[PDB]
Amino acid sequence: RKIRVGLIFGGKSAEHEVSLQSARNILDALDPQRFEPVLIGIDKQGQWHVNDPDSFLLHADDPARIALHRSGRGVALLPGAQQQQLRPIQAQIDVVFPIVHGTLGEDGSLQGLLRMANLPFVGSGVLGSAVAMDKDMAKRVLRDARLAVAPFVCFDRHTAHADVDTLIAQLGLPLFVKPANQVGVSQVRTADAFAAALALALAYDHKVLVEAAVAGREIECAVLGNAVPHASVCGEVVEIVIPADIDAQTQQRIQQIAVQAYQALGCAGMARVDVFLCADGRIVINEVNTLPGFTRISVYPKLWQASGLDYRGLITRLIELALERHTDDQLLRSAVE
């Protein structure tokens, strides 16, 4: 009757601690009429630990020291299994809410594990996560959908044969140098600082984007839904200001763009879309993020709060969307001969 929600959190990530705080907040807001929580923390070495709600954190109330209780109660996954798919090394989960920051948590890999275990789960599936996480691929698909993105060139080790001059002629200055995996970012103000930015970024990814500058205000907008996505009110990064000080017509066209970008990349459940709003009213997509923050101070939930969707209720909707997707997939999977 109650649904069992497996919260998987942590990750090998600079944002590890953000995932800890999010898990705590989700746990406090989970509608206890409907959901029972099961907790799986992933430490900074990538090891999985089951915990109880009341002892999953060390120094919970100290932001500078908060950490995962590495209980050493390990987890096995049974691929192809239809029940008890998550097994203790040495509770049945009905839906997974993954908030694992870092490459594997965000890039479709964990999502693929969850599919292989036949687990419903919150957020974008394999494709949507993989595409959004790879900033090179995400921009090519956005571009093809006729949405505006910063002009850019993408390099790998084998082509980084980079001519700073041709780059400046095409893209200008300053240039933003980014590893394609959504640290290693640099604002290159002069042609001479480029070489080093290129080199730093390539320590983090096999692919590095070089982007022209976009002049404009930074507006962020929350999307929720599967096939019929909805958009929150906008927020302006000034340090966030909700609702953004922009007219109705402008908010509406950013909302519409956010939904369209989301559909193009094949997102589901949730994304935060970050755009630039230029002086002439052009809207340029900076980033589509399939794993927003879920702390009480994170932008994504505050954007929905300001749109009349409360935190408990956001969480409940994300779970319902995960179950909806799963049951629809169920029929199509079962159509194979």
- Detail the residues annotated as belonging to a binding site for Mg(2+): 274, 287, 289
How many residues at the interface with a second copy, by CB under 8 A?
60
Instruction: Provide the token pair at 207.
Output: 């692919």
Q: Are 44 and 53 in contact (CB under 8 A)?
A: no
Binding-site residues, in ranges, read 135, 176-178, 211-218, 274, 286-287, 289
Q: Which of residues 282-301 bind Mg ion (CB under 5 A)?
A: 286-287
Distance of CA 7 to the CA centre of its chain: 16
260: contact with a second copy by CB under 8 A: no
Identify the residue among 108, 233, 274, 301 touching Mg ion (CB under 5 A): 274
Q: Are 201 and 208 in contact (CB under 8 A)?
A: yes
From ligand ADP, Mg ion, a second copy, none, which one binds at residue 213 (CB under 5 to 8 Å depending on kind)? ligand ADP
Q: Which of residues 306-325 bind a second copy (CB under 8 A)?
A: none
Please report, to the nearest 10 degrees, the dihedral formed by the alpha carbons of residues 169, 172, 177, 180 taken in order.
-70
The position carrying tokens 């001479």 is 192
List residues bridging with 71 in a β-sheet: none
74: contact with a second copy by CB under 8 A: yes
71: contact with a second copy by CB under 8 A: no
205: contact with ligand ADP by CB under 6 A: no
Binding-site residues for ADP, in ranges, read 176, 178, 211-212, 214, 218
CA distances (Å), origin 242, targets 33, 158, 222, 223: 31, 44, 12, 15
Give me the helices (H) in the chain, please: 16-29, 103-106, 109-116, 126-133, 135-144, 164-171, 194-202, 248-265, 299-305, 311-333
Least separation in angstroms between CB 102 and a second copy: 7
Least separation in angstroms between CB 258 and Mg ion: 13
Q: Is 314 helix (H, G, I), strand (E, B) or coil?
A: helix
Q: Which region among 43-51, 79-87, 101-109, 212-220 touches ligand ADP (by CB under 6 A)? A: 212-220
218: contact with Mg ion by CB under 5 A: no
64: contact with a second copy by CB under 8 A: no
Which one, of 9, 240, 53, 154, lies nearest residue 232 by Cα?
240
The position carrying tokens 């930015």 is 197
Chain residues in the site for ligand ADP (CB under 6 A): 150, 176, 185, 211, 213-214, 218, 286-287
Chain residues in the site for a second copy (CB under 8 A): 12-14, 42, 45-48, 74-81, 87, 89, 102-104, 107-113, 115-116, 118, 126-127, 130-131, 133-134, 137, 140-141, 143-145, 156-158, 183, 203-206, 227-228, 266, 328, 332-333, 335-337
